[PDB]
Structure formats: C-alpha cells, structure tokens
Ligand binder design. Structure first.
Ligand SMILES: O=C(O)[C@@H]1CCC[C@@H]1c1ccc2cnccc2c1
Length: 166
C-alpha cells in the first residue's frame, strides 16, 4: 500500500507522527476513522479537523444520518462518505472520560476496525476524550487484527507512545 514513513509496531499496527487530515489528503485511503460522538457533532479534535477539511459536508451528511437513524451507541460506529479525504469515513465512538463514560467500552470501539481490511485512524478516546493514549494504543494492538495506520498529531505524544511501547 501507499502509506509511507510509519513505524511498524506489530504484524498489523503501524504508527506515524502526522496530521490525520494531511495524511488522508495525501493517501486518499479506503477508510479514514473519525473520533466521533454519538450525535455525530463534529466540533473539535479529530472530528472538527476532518469536518473542516470537508468544508462542512461531513456535518451536513451526518445531520441527515442522525435525523434518520438516531444517535450511535458508545462503542459503536457507522460508515459514511469520506468526501474529499477518503472513500469512506468510519465514525467510531470511543468512551469520553470527560463525560464519565466507561473506558471498558474502548475495546468494543476498536472492534469496529476489524470490519475493514485497512484503515487510517487516530487513537480512540485519547486527546479531548480524556483517556490515557498509552492505554488506547495497547487496546488497539490487542483488539484490531486488520491493518491499521495510526496518525498521532502531537510529536511529543508520538515519541512517548513509541518509547513506552511494549
Ligand atoms: O493524535 C494526537 O495527538 C491525539 C491523540 C488522539 C487524537 C489527538 C489529537 C490531537 C490534536 C489533533 C489535531 N488535529 C487533528 C487531529 C488531532 C488529534
């Protein structure tokens, strides 16, 4: 495949210090993962950045999805368009520790990735979702079996994740 510059962590997990918006524009992957909430309100973090890169088209599509189907479950996902970034966007809801949600749902959230052979993704529940990114990477490695290319925006966090990886 065309992903370049990644550190191989395991047989199927790869990681890079990169802005997932810029990576998606360069690679045009089959699937880019959004760190969504149950309402698909793409305000900040990964979701706000991906949505802004689509000129708000992701939000317009998402509002129609919710009007038809109602909210997602914490730990659940839906497949929508990837717009100008990817063929598809897999919107995955990891638990938000800053809203008091159960971190055990993080494994269920990563299981959605197994429905796709290859994905470009952020660490679920990390960043503004409040979980420990080292824990998120561990759950990713121990749950996802398909090929996942993780983009970590912050260089300092990337270096901490590599240097602490078991
Ligand atoms: O990758 C990271 O550094 C952390 C870990 C979970 C996602 C979070 C993050 C932070 C800033 C971001 C800016 N722009 C886009 C995506 C972004 C994602």
């Amino acid at each position: 495949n065309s992903f370049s510059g990644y550190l191989k962590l395991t047989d199927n997990v790869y990681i890079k210090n990169a802005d997932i918006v810029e990576e998606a524009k360069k690679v045009k992957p089959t699937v880019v993962v959004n760190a969504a909430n149950v309402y698909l309100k793409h305000g900040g973090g990964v979701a706000g950045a991906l949505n802004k890169a689509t000129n708000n088209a992701m939000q317009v599509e998402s509002d129609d999805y919710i009007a038809t189907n109602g909210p997602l479950k914490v730990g659940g996902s839906c497949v929508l368009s990837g717009h100008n970034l990817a063929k598809h966007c897999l919107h995955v809801v990891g638990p938000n520790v800053n809203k008091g949600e159960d971190i055990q749902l993080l494994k269920s959230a990563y299981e959605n990735f197994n429905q796709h052979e290859v994905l470009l993704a952020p660490l679920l529940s990390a960043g503004i979702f409040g979980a420990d990114p080292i824990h998120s990477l561990r759950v990713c490695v121990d749950t996802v079996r398909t090929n996942v290319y993780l983009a970590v925006f912050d260089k300092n966090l990337y270096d901490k994740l590599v240097s602490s990886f078991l």
